[PDB]
């Protein structure tokens, strides 16, 4: 009934605890040493982190919580707005967008990013058979690559051309900076941080509000938002919204994907049983120059292996959640309206009553049937009518992507390459290197 | 543009398709070799089957497309006359009884209703507790007693007392082979029929004479938590006029008919598939003990159960227990750019082929994944129709989801069930679907009411 709560430093309560370059990792040690659920405060808040699925199933029942804006992601709306990622359930603007972005990321609506995920995937295997003889690849920043070229591509028909590039593009470089100083707030004389925003910001409203004014037809986000309605108010997206939809895509839509295939190399190399009965089914699948959308949908193991590096190292490592009125959590725990939650997904995928006691092996069996895995067990993409409206743009390009490079490439983990995990607001391999074998198949 | 047609009978065409006791699952079979659409033709007949969700998101634009009596609804117009569910639309009342009905089946209207759908639900679960060792559950009846009893009760604050019988009430004997005789018809005229007629008009009348004499015995002046006080007590805001005590009785004999065997048959089917299907089933279990921790369950914690519901969804994902229904073209119309209409012509939504439309819901359309419903954003647009369509959609929706939703908690709550016979799933048609002789053994987990 009484909560744990990690070592305080007087005033500043648990807060310095989070002045570290591995915040979430540092929390899943804390996790480790004081279990399922302990309070953590710092001046002028209060909340409590989640870890275990007995307190999660509850946490995400939505008549009962519904999602919070962590810190983070208050820092993150001064420049992301009231996109979908950043505004609260109540807003207008969430349920409206919400309404009028679904149909354009359903299953059905990949069929129609297919050809540009392809054109993008293509340029990946290509830049990978023009290497020389022992040069390596570098995994993080050549998936970044792809991801952030995909959505730009498949977004609103604008081509980043990262692959033509070493410095990257100045409106992801703001992005990242800005990210960067949201991050660092939360950590934390500081006036030129502030001027150093403002000019980020900038630089990404001045180039979004440009795409948008010079297209106002093709298959992308933005010919959707533009004339989409909410079939509820009868309504369509503002401009300035529509812009701040664009910025949550660009960030929300490249980084958590490129840490997925990032990761799921990482634990294919360092499993090469693993890594070849997922090759063996590229093979057996990809039999075509080009993967079709269909084929991608056959690419079960393929699939498998994203769900559990999604399962060791979720991309977008926590969610928030707030109390809608007085409840008791797990029988013991009584909260108060209003009061928070954090969900480690890290830590819950790490529930040995769920997983059993090799939840650190990497298993992709674990998820051959979703109806033998417990409720709110899993929870990579987030809760509710709050979860990533991209999962399935997501899940298609990494398993496109994935196929692809299991289809024509072996893999040399040629450095032995010790896990070292990057923490922004979301989580990379830093340092993650390869060699890649051809296989000499022509696209 | 040219459009597939099953083989044909001469001069009877393909009417003696239908000449088959699983006419239902013999068109799924011809949707299967033809295709999202063809045309089926008898004597005096032409309509078209729509097996796609394509063609049927067309089929469900009500601008072109308005509900179409079936033959099979006209028969059962014989007895539930213009109640809501065999008149048509610009009758005027169809709209006058929406309407007036509409706020007493809406989720919120639920809270009241959920007294009497707990006292049977405890019938249920008490006659199951008291069966003797290797004694089994006759499922689809029991299912029936239920969700009879529940309406009859909700409905009208009525007691058919099913638990307490083995032949049912003299109006469901009825009602049951009025329907039969309905259904009947649609494969069948000559002198051997002509009993069928004095005996369908006997039927009649026993249904007529004990709702009327109930909407009079009630008109004492009591009141009760029943659509009938709200239909008595109803005015149409359009008209401003009320029920009158005839149409009345098509509404009640709408609803006992309408809102009990589609009912049952999801009842039945979710409990098939969760015994098939040993991880749904303990997932399903986990929910319904942690959620009802009450002896009694409470309408909110009714609503807690979300599993249960996905499983509910999934189950009729699979078999729609009302399989099908029709419609007419308002004006000429091109149905997917290739199918020419002309005003009036017909459709029919084959529910089940839908529900299977790999296109929509992948390749494993024939598993049990109650998982598909996991987040309802996912869904196509009518991708999933077990309740119709438009302004003609099933009104008692929110009323079968909730007694289904209670009562298979509470069986998941109260027992462990055993697929003893490892029952091979036959499905028997009537108008609606039904899985014939399932049969389980329940063993208590004694936990008490
Ligand atoms: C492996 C890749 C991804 C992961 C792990 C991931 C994870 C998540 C999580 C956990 C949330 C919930 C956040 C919260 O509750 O505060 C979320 C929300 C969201 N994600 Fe993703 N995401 C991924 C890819 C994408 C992509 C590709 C897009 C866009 C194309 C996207 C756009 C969004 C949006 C708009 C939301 C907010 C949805 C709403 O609240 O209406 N994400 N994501
Ligand atoms: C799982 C259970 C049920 C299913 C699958 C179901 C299915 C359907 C379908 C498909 C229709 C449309 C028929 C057509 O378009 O020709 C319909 C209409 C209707 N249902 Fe249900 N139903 C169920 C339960 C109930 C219940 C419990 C009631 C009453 C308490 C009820 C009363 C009605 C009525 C009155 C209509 C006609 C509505 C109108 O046209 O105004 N049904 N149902
Ligand atoms: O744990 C986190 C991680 C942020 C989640 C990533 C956001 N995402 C979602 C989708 N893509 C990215 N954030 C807390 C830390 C904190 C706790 C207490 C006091 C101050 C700060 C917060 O921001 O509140
Ligand atoms: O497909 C059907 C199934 C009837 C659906 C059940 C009705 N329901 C709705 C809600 N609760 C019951 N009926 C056709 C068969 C037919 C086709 C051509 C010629 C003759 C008969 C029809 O009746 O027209």
Redesign the interface.
């Known amino acids: 009934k009484e909560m744990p709560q990690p070592k305080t430093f007087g005033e500043l309560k648990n807060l310095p605890l989070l002045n570290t370059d591995k915040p979430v990792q540092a929390l899943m040690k804390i996790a480790d040493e004081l279990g399922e659920i302990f309070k953590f405060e710092a001046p002028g808040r209060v909340t409590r982190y989640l870890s275990s699925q007995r307190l999660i199933k509850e946490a995400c029942?939505e008549?009962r919580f519904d999602k919070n804006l962590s810190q983070a992601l208050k820092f993150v709306r001064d420049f992301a707005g009231d996109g979908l990622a950043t505004s609260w359930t109540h807003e207008k603007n969430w349920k409206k967008a919400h309404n009028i972005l679904?149909?354009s990321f359903?299953?059905?609506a990949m069929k129609g990013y297919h050809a540009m995920m392809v054109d993008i995937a293509v340029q990946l295997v290509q830049k990978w058979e023009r290497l020389n003889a022992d040069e390596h690849i570098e995994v993080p920043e050549d998936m970044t690559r792809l991801t952030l070229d995909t959505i730009g591509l498949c977004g609103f028909n604008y081509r980043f051309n990262s692959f033509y590039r070493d410095q990257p593009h100045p409106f992801i470089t703001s992005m990242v900076r800005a990210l960067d100083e949201a991050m660092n707030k939360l950590q934390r004389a500081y006036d030129e941080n502030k001027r150093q925003f403002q000019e980020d910001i900038k630089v990404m409203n001045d180039l979004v509000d440009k795409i948008i004014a010079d297209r106002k037809q093709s298959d992308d986000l933005l010919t959707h938002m533009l004339n989409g309605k909410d079939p509820e108010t009868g309504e369509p997206l503002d401009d300035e919204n529509i812009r701040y939809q664009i910025i949550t895509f660009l960030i929300a839509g490249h980084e958590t994907t490129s840490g997925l295939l990032s990761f799921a190399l990482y634990f294919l190399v360092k499993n090469p049983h693993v890594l070849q009965k997922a090759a063996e089914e590229a093979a057996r699948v990809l039999v075509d120059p080009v993967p079709s959308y269909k084929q991608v949908?056959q690419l079960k193991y393929v699939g498998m292996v994203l769900n559990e590096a999604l399962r060791l190292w979720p991309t977008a490592p926590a969610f928030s959640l707030y109390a809608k009125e007085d409840t008791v959590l797990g029988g013991e725990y009584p909260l108060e309206k209003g009061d928070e939650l954090m969900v480690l997904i890290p830590q819950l995928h790490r529930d040995k009553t769920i997983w059993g006691d090799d939840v650190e092996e990497f298993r992709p069996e674990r998820f051959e049937?979703?109806?033998?895995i417990?409720?709110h067990a899993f929870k990579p993409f987030g809760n509710?009518?709050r979860?990533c409206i991209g999962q399935?743009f997501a899940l298609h390009e990494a398993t496109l992507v994935l196929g692809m490079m299991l289809k024509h490439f072996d893999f040399e983990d040629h450095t032995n390459y010790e896990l070292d995990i990057k923490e922004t607001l979301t989580l990379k391999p830093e340092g993650f290197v390869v060699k890649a074998k051809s296989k000499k198949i022509p696209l």
């Open positions: 029942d008549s679904l149909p359903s299953q059905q949908k049937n979703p109806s033998a417990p409720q509710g009518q979860a399935q």
